Structures are given as C-alpha cells and as structure tokens.
Design a protein around this ligand. Structure first.
Ligand code: A1CVQ
Length: 299
C-alpha cells in the first residue's frame, strides 16, 4: 500500500511552483526544483522549507543529487545553460555547465562523469574538468526518438542513446535496437542484464526480445534502490509532463503490481535511499500552476 503521510506546497507563494523532486543523501530532506528555477530543500515530514538556491531563470525539469551528497545536476526548460552541475559542500556553487543539453544524468557505478542529451545526441563530460570527452551519434543507426534521454548502464561500460547501445571505451555503436515507437528511447535495468525500451524488454547478451509490456508505453520509469519495484508514468502526448496515473511493476518479472490514479496531473516522482517513501509532485489545479508534494509511506 501507499499510506499518505504528508503534503506541502512552496512556502509563502500565492501559487506553488514545485516541478521536480529528489531525496537528498540526508534522510528526511527532499530537494525540489521550481517553475522559476529555484532549488529548495524541504523537511518532507514537517513540510517546512529549510533552504533555497537560485539555479536557473526558467523552470527546473530534472534534478539528480550525487550519492555522496557533494554534487547536484539540474536541467531547465528554456535557460542558457540548459543544465548544470552544482557543488553542495560549504558553499552552493556552480561547478560546470552543459549549455545545450536539456537532460543530464551521472554515471552510475563511479559518479565521475555526466551524460547529457541534446535531441538524439549524447555528450559525456568529466566532472572534475567539465570537458566534453565524447559525442555519441551514428547517422546510420539513429532511431530519431522524439523524447530521447541518454543513460549509462550500471557498470558505466555501456551507454544507451536513441535506442543505440554504445561501448564507451571504444566510443563505437555495438547494436541498434529496432524502433517500435516514436518517442521513448529506453533505460537499463539495474540488474545489468536487460534493456527496457518502451514496451520492449531486450536481453543485453543475445539482443533477443524477452518480453513485451504494453502498459509501459510512453512511460518514464524509475526503480527503487533495491531494484525490486519499477514505477512508470505515461507522458502526455508549463504543462504537466505526465497524466494523472502512475503504475508499479515487479522489477524481477515485469508483472504489474498496482495502477495508482491520483486524479491530478503528475509533475514528478522519486523514492528515498531506504525505499521507505515515495514523493510525488501533483498539480492541484489544471493547465493554474499550484503544485503540492505528496509523501507516501511505501508499505
Ligand atoms: N528523473 C526522474 C523521474 C522521472 N521524471 C521525469 O522523467 C520527468 C519529470 N519532469 C520531466 C519534465 C518536465 C518538463 O519538461 N516540464 C515541467 C516543468 C515546466 C516545463 C516542462 C520529466 C521528463 C519528461 C520526459 C523526458 Cl524524455 C525526460 C524527463 F526527465 C519519473 C519517472 C517515473 C515516473 F512515474 C514519474 Cl511521474 C517521473
């Protein structure tokens, strides 16, 4: 079950502008991006704001804190630069920026690199220097996915970009997964064995199709930390990225668990490092922007 535990809005604002969320390394603190480009730290139980920082001059679309707690990636919708890396030690400061990338993630095993996406192109950057190490794009294998996001695999040896599997070491495309949809480019299963590209589950070894999961169509997905549950929400074709529902799946067999209809448009969802909690950003109005963060205890 998901027990509603708490709800809160952007403190002292006429209209609440939370757009995205991620749990900090610190257990009871949630980081939230806003529609005006600020990063906020909230106590997720009290709903009280602790800290605010100015990151971009447009809405934050994505946040990702590093596991050690020292770094943060942000992306914005219509700012220059579009994405940035922030230090969060003593002073909150911009380390580096990724001017043309509308989406960024850290490498997974060792978080020493950033991977940014621009359209169907992946850029890989060194965290220390900020230098672009690699541009990944192959005109012969491109799928031209409209909502492409590039990502590392769990051991950082591989990248999936626009439905193409890359060997990072050699910077060579090693396989193109055939295209079944217009938008979604796919992610790696944390088990390191499978690639989830929209409704298709591919075996990484053989490149054979393992399953078709229709309910995943047009979904962004996130896994809990233990890799046992997958959350998916369907993209809509300052508007909300998602519709009013998200779905859970058993990550070990891809069997559905629950379909949760929150009856309001969803902006984001994240889970805490202990997989005890789910945070969901939902609009109380309809595109009126007045979002709340709802916190559920995961049963
Ligand atoms: N990280 C993470 C968690 C992940 N969030 C998103 O994917 C997400 C969360 N938010 C935006 C986008 C806002 C956006 O563009 N906005 C909203 C603010 C005003 C401007 C437009 C995106 C998003 C959408 C398209 C693309 Cl291809 C990639 C994106 F990251 C998620 C995973 C499973 C889920 F069940 C849910 Cl509800 C969210």
């Amino acid at each position: 079950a998901f027990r509603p535990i708490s709800v809160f809005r952007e403190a002292n604002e006429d209209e609440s502008g939370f757009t995205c969320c991620a749990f900090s390394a610190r257990e009871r603190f949630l980081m939230l991006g806003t529609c005006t480009g600020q990063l906020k730290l909230y106590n997720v139980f009290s709903g009280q704001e602790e800290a605010s920082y100015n990151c971009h001059n447009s809405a934050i679309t994505h946040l990702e804190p590093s596991r050690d707690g020292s770094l943060l990636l942000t992306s914005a919708t219509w700012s220059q630069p579009l994405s940035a890396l922030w230090g969060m030690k003593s002073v909150f400061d911009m380390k580096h920026s990724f001017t043309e990338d509308h989406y960024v993630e850290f490498s997974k095993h060792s978080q020493d690199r950033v991977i940014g996406t621009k359209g169907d192109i992946a850029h890989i950057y060194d965290i220390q220097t900020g230098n672009k190490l690699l541009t990944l794009f192959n005109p012969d294998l491109a799928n031209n996915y409209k909502r492409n996001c590039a990502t590392f695999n769990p051991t950082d040896d591989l990248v999936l970009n626009d439905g193409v599997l890359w060997d990072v070491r050699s910077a060579q495309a090693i396989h193109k997964f055939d295209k079944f949809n217009m938008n979604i480019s796919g992610v790696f299963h944390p088990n390191g064995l499978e690639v989830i590209i929209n409704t298709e589950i591919w075996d990484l070894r053989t490149f054979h199709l393992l399953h078709t999961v229709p309910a995943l169509d047009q979904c962004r997905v996130v896994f809990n930390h233990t890799g046992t549950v997958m959350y998916g929400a369907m993209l809509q074709a300052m508007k909300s990225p998602f519709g009013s529902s998200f779905r859970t799946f058993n990550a070990t067999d891809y069997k559905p668990i629950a379909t949760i209809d929150v009856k309001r448009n969803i902006f984001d969802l994240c889970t805490d490092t202990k997989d005890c909690y789910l945070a969901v950003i939902e609009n109380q109005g309809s595109m009126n922007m007045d979002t709340v963060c709802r916190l559920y205890e995961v049963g």
